[PDB]
């Protein structure tokens, strides 16, 4: 029996007309929906999923360079030029150097020097955008007691009709709540690891980055963040890569929480919805059975739940099944008027075998009352006291 | 008999003492020196020669070039530089050229261009300096009648003692006259030809030239006079030699007079000297002969010379030789009182054979007189009239 121990549980009742009922859904929460002559079905909102995230930025933390070259010129011979400076893939550096007779120049002065190297990224990390169009809410609806359907709902597709076997179907219509969802974070990935990071911090990471997804060939920006050029030779300049920066990010990610992405879809926790659900086509069993006639027995003694309700487990020692279960509460007993109400509304034992067990959940009135199971002389009762008031 | 028909003839007489006699010597002239009881010897100054001329300037009229190269630069790439521009042997040219995308530059602008070529001279012409130390005067002294010595005299060696066989020696002391010699000309040579040129015109010849003699390797100046640089492409420039210029000088040398240099010495015409000549050791034959006794005969009738003197040729039909010739002039003919004077002073017939001929030159007095040859009854006479007065 579901939603029994859920702390964040809600009880919604049905209108006089009997179609519109409003609910609000929390992740890690439940809503018990009761309506007049209706199966009393539980809605959960169990899973929030994101998928198909458009990539915003991709930062590189491990670089490599090749074909390094330099060009020099004596004073009064102009600026140095290598074919590679206008090439966007290469990172360059231009400076003046003291030239003279000792370096192969006919005079002593500052000469032009340029040095370039092709920058390639060996290992990159990726940031992805989390927008409403990427969301996927998995909501499970279950007959409180084939009889539990799961549905998935998009913000671009709010509706879904959950089908329950003999009970018809429930029609979910929802809309995304404003303020209780994410927009200020990105889905940072890093060598099959995954995190959630403040996108504001994300834009200020001192590493090379390109602005699109992996288009044609990525044009990296701020290549000097990993590549520095060592002081100054007269005709050369030495270029060095910093190497792997994975440890720097793993330590910059101190408080970040991890996620799980067993495929292309990313799992995480929270979620908040609001839903009008249509029960016009929800029915209790289209066949009216007779009552179970044999003796019942309390296996689990009545036990109070967090919300004031009580749960009872019986085992019906008869074969009449499928028969309705005679279950009510009574303050008179002589005889025999119902008080309170059942949560497991219209209990039915479909089991045709001998010693079928069944759990019930009753909503006792305040004060004293008797839980009554069975019909005839061999019926069972159990006192129950509930405290509090309106 | 020398100096007989010379138009520029001079007659110098002897002092009472008999050692010092002044003369002035013209090229193409003669000086007859008569002294008391002396051989009466003729000085000429026949030749003026120059030698060992220090070369002043050497011009080139035929050039050739090799290893031509160029260096270029796009705008903002500095000045062009080839190793051979600081090399003095090469002639270079530096200019700007329109550069652009069509010439292999990322810019449109004026680019530096230099072009150099090695200049070598195939054939040169030379100018030589004519200074007093280069002079050489050849003076010939001859007994008027072994008996003619030639002497050479330098301005750095003014003296020379001419040796005549039986007559002793004449001592020449001279000094170069001031103003009647050359200094404003050079000895221009050109492919074994030779000229005299005004050095002022020589310093303005538009051709390559070096300033010394052929030292180490000649450094030529004004190489652009033969080497012009034709129009300049973006990366190249064409260099061209004019070729031989010999005809240009042969036509610029319109009025120049040629010389002759059969060896390292160059002989030419003019010359002027002045000399004291010492006749203390000049003697008439140290033996006193007797008079010729046989008959004389006039072969050449007495003929007047340009200077009023007269010449007579006799043939002595006697064997007395060596005998002194009786020759005088007389106006009385009862007595043989000498009048005028002999120029062929103290004539001697050294010939011992039968019909020896001899030429005499007499200096007749003004008016009438008789040329008297011989001594005795068979002596010959010839009337002679000379016109003019003191």
């Amino acid at each position: 029996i579901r939603c029994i121990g859920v702390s964040n549980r809600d009880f919604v009742e049905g209108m006089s007309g009997g179609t519109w009922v409003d609910v609000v859904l929390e992740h890690g929460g439940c809503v018990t929906v009761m309506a007049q002559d209706k199966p009393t079905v539980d809605i959960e909102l169990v899973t929030t999923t994101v998928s198909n995230m458009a990539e915003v930025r991709s930062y590189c933390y491990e670089a490599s360079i090749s074909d390094m070259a330099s060009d020099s010129r004596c004073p009064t011979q102009g600026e140095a030029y290598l074919d590679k400076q206008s090439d966007t893939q290469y990172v360059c550096k231009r400076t003046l150097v003291d030239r003279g007779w000792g370096n192969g120049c006919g005079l002593f002065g500052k000469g032009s020097l340029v040095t370039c190297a092709k920058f390639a990224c060996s290992k990159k990390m990726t940031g992805k955008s989390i927008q409403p169009e990427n969301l996927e809410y998995r909501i499970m609806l279950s007959v409180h007691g084939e009889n539990r359907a799961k549905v998935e709902i998009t913000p671009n597709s709010p509706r879904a009709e959950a089908t329950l076997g003999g009970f018809g179907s429930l029609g979910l219509d929802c809309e995304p709540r404003t303020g209780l969802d994410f927009s200020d974070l990105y889905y940072l990935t890093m060598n099959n690891k995954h995190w959630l990071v403040h996108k504001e911090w994300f834009h200020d990471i001192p590493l090379p980055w390109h602005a699109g997804a992996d288009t044609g060939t990525p044009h990296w920006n701020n290549k000097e963040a990993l590549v520095e050029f060592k002081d100054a030779h007269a005709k050369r300049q030495t270029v060095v890569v910093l190497g792997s920066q994975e440890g720097a990010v793993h330590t910059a990610l101190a408080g970040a929480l991890e996620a799980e992405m067993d495929g292309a879809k990313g799992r995480l926790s929270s979620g908040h919805l609001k839903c009008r659900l249509k029960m016009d086509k929800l029915r209790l069993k289209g066949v009216s059975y007779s009552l179970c006639t044999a003796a019942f027995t309390f296996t689990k003694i009545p036990a109070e739940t967090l919300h004031g309700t009580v749960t009872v487990e019986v085992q019906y020692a008869g074969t009449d099944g499928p028969c309705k279960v005679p279950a009510q509460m009574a303050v008179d007993m002589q005889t025999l008027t119902p008080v309170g109400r059942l949560i497991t509304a219209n209990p039915v034992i479909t089991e045709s075998t001998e010693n079928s067990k069944m759990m019930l959940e009753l909503d006792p009135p305040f004060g004293d009352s008797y839980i009554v199971i069975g019909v005839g002389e061999k019926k069972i009762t159990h006192h129950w006291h509930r405290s509090g008031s309106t | 008999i020398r100096c007989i028909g010379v138009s520029n003839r001079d007659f110098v007489e002897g002092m009472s003492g008999g050692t010092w006699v002044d003369v002035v010597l013209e090229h193409g002239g003669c000086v007859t020196v008569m002294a008391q009881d002396k051989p009466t010897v003729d000085i000429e100054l026949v030749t003026t020669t120059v030698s060992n001329m220090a070369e002043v300037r050497s011009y080139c009229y035929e050039a050739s070039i090799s290893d031509m190269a160029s260096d270029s630069r796009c705008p903002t790439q500095g000045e062009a530089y080839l190793d051979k521009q600081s090399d003095t042997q090469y002639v270079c040219k530096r200019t700007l050229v329109d550069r652009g995308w069509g010439n292999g530059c990322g810019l449109f602008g004026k680019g530096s261009l230099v072009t150099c070529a090695k200049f070598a001279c195939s054939k040169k012409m030379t100018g030589k300096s004519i200074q007093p130390e280069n002079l050489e005067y050849r003076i010939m002294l001859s007994v008027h009648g072994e008996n003619r010595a030639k002497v050479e005299i330098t301005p750095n060696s003014p003296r020379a003692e001419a040796t005549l066989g039986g007559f002793g020696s004449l001592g020449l002391d001279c000094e170069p006259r001031t103003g009647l010699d050359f200094s404003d000309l050079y000895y221009l040579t050109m492919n074994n030809k030779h000229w005299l040129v005004h050095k002022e015109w020589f310093h303005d010849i538009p051709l390559p030239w070096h300033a010394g003699a052929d030292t180490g390797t000649p450094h030529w100046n004004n190489k652009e006079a033969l080497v012009e640089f034709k129009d300049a492409h973006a990366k190249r420039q064409t260099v061209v030699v004019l070729g031989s210029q010999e005809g240009a000088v042969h036509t610029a040398l319109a009025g120049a007079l040629e010389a002759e240099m059969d060896g390292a010495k160059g002989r030419l015409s003019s010359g002027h000297l002045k000399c004291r000549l010492k006749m203390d050791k000049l003697r008439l034959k140290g033996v006193s002969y007797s008079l010729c006794t046989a008959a004389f005969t006039f072969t050449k009738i007495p003929a007047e010379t340009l200077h009023g003197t007269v010449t007579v040729e006799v043939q002595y039909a006697g064997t007395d030789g060596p005998c002194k010739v009786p020759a005088q002039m007389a106006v009385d003919m009862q007595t043989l009182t000498p009048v005028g004077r002999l120029i062929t002073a103290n004539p001697v017939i050294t010939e011992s054979t039968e019909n020896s001929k001899m030429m005499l030159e007499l200096d007749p007095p003004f008016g009438d007189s008789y040329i008297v040859i011989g001594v005795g009854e068979k002596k010959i006479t010839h009337h002679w009239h000379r016109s003019g007065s003191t």
């Epitope: 004073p75 009064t76 006919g106 005079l107 | -």
Partner: antibody, heavy 118, light 108 residues
Amino acid sequence: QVQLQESGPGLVKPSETLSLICTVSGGSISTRDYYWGWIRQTPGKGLEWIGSIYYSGGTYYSPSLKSRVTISVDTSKNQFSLKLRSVTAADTAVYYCARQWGNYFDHWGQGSLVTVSS
Amino acid sequence: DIVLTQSPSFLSASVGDRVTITCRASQGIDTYLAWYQQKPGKAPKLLIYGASTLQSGVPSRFSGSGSGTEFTLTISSLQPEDFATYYCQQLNNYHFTFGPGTKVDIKR
């Protein structure tokens, strides 16, 4: 304060070799920052550079005199030497030794007059 | 080689005047140019290097400016000891070469 002093003013015969020594005071010669040069001056009054040399020994000569010039260093005695050969009357001049601070001559010597005649 | 030119050649000024001397290189030497001072019977004295830097111990009167090919040495408030001929000097292609010199006489 570096001081430079060329060897005494001297007389040289034509076609013989001119030999000068300038000795450095007030500072080192085995230093990496400076060069060490020779500069002439004919009377009236042009300055001509002859050549410079490194304490290591590396020479740099004018192309107009390269074939006649030889410059040497003696780091142990803090001096350097100029040698011109095949001297003529055109080489009569005052010869200066100078410290070259890479592109300029920051310190000079008093100068030594060399006269060339027989 | 680069042949430097200097203007004017001679000039007579008077104490207190401001004198300007110009130097011209055929090729771009950007700022690698010097000015020297040579009094009679003495060695040159480096005044300016780098075409605008004053050398230590040189009076504030002297200054230099220029880039490329045309450089200018300026003498504020000329003094009677400033008698000298001034030379510009540049180095290029392992070759030192000096200017022709600007003689500066004093008028009083």
